[PDB]
Curated annotation (Swiss-Prot):
Principal localisation: nucleus
Domain notes: The AF-2 (activation function-2) motif is required for recruiting coregulators containing LXXLL motifs such as NCOA1 and NCOA2.
Range covered out of full length: 266 to 507 of 518
Species of the source: Homo sapiens (Human)
Function: Nuclear receptor that binds DNA as a monomer to ROR response elements (RORE) containing a single core motif half-site 5'-AGGTCA-3' preceded by a short A-T-rich sequence. Key regulator of cellular differentiation, immunity, peripheral circadian rhythm as well as lipid, steroid, xenobiotics and glucose metabolism. Considered to have intrinsic transcriptional activity, have some natural ligands like oxysterols that act as agonists (25-hydroxycholesterol) or inverse agonists (7-oxygenated sterols), enhancing or repressing the transcriptional activity, respectively.
Name under which the protein is recorded: Nuclear receptor ROR-gamma
Leader sequence segment: none
Short motif AF-2, span: 236-241
Gene that this sequence comes from: RORC
Complexes and interactors: Interacts (via AF-2 motif) with the coactivator NCOA2 (via LXXLL motif). Interacts with the corepressor NCOR1. Interacts with CRY1. Interacts (via AF-2 motif) with the coactivators NCOA1 and PPARGC1A (via LXXLL motif). Interacts (via AF-2 motif) with PROX1. Interacts with FOXP3. Interacts with NR0B2.
Similarity comment: Belongs to the nuclear hormone receptor family. NR1 subfamily.
């Protein structure tokens, strides 16, 4: 069924298009729109907890778009609810991290944050310079691949649909989805003469370790200074918040 796989490609790309928050053309246009030194200093003088509140809410929104992305993946809703949650808890923040590279400019090492581009010194008040530097470096690595929009869509679908996640109840069912998405991805790379990115993608442990350091920091901030979340996915919220 060649058209089944082509239909999967089109359905993954559409779900991605509907949930990607900002258009790539917008991010690229805005690359010349850079925070002044005066604006940077304004961010640096903000309280750690106000920066935390801002960043925690951007990350919450980013997670919720990734959840909607997964819910629109063919067959995701047909998994048992325990499995949907296992997959989202393990991979939705990894997808957020991958998606960030779209908003990263490697020429000057800046990210699109709250309407303009700025460097990692924008986040000085958070006092997490090691984590921030790891996120920038990871985004720097990915930007070298010059990911197309469909590659990011297909790759991030696979970040989520991983039948090796511990705790899955219907592993065979997740495997079926995973095989079709892998075929979708590899077919698409072949059609576009882009199979060379396959050897350049992040080692799986790199993404896993960055996200576990990232989420652990968010849990520390959330314990010290909890933000209020507009919970759209009760079974998922319940696993992350306590
Ligand atoms: O709308 C909903 O129901 C909903 C449900 C779950 C949900 O989790 C968000 C989340 C967080 C996080 C964030 Cl982003 C901000 C502040 C504190 C945390 C904290 F660390 F405390 F959890 N970290 O990892 C995640 C995560 C989710 C899935 C994988 N990982 C956000 C929204």
């Amino acid at each position: 069924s060649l058209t089944e796989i082509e239909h999967l490609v089109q359905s993954v790309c559409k779900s991605y298009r509907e949930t990607c928050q900002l258009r790539l053309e917008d991010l690229l246009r805005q690359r010349s729109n850079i925070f002044s030194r005066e604006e940077v200093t304004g961010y640096q003088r903000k309280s750690m907890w106000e920066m935390w509140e801002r960043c925690a809410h951007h990350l919450t929104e980013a997670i919720q778009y990734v959840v909607e992305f997964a819910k629109r993946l063919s067959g995701f809703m047909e998994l048992c609810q325990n499995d949907q949650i296992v997959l989202l808890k393990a991979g939705a923040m990894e997808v957020v991290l991958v998606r960030m590279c779209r908003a990263y400019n490697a020429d000057n090492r800046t990210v699109f944050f709250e309407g303009k581009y700025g460097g990692m010194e924008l986040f000085r008040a958070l006092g997490c310079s090691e984590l921030i530097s790891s996120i920038f470096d990871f985004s720097h690595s990915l930007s070298a691949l010059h990911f197309s929009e469909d590659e990011i869509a297909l790759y991030t679908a696979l970040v989520l649909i991983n039948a090796h996640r511990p705790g899955l109840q219907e592993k065979r069912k997740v495997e079926q989805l995973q095989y079709n998405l892998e075929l979708a991805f590899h077919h698409h790379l072949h059609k576009t003469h882009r199979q060379s990115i396959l050897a350049k993608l992040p080692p799986k442990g790199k993404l896993r370790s960055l996200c576990s350091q990232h989420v652990e920091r968010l849990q520390i901030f959330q314990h010290l200074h909890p933000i209020v979340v507009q919970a759209a996915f009760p079974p998922l919220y319940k696993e992350l918040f306590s």
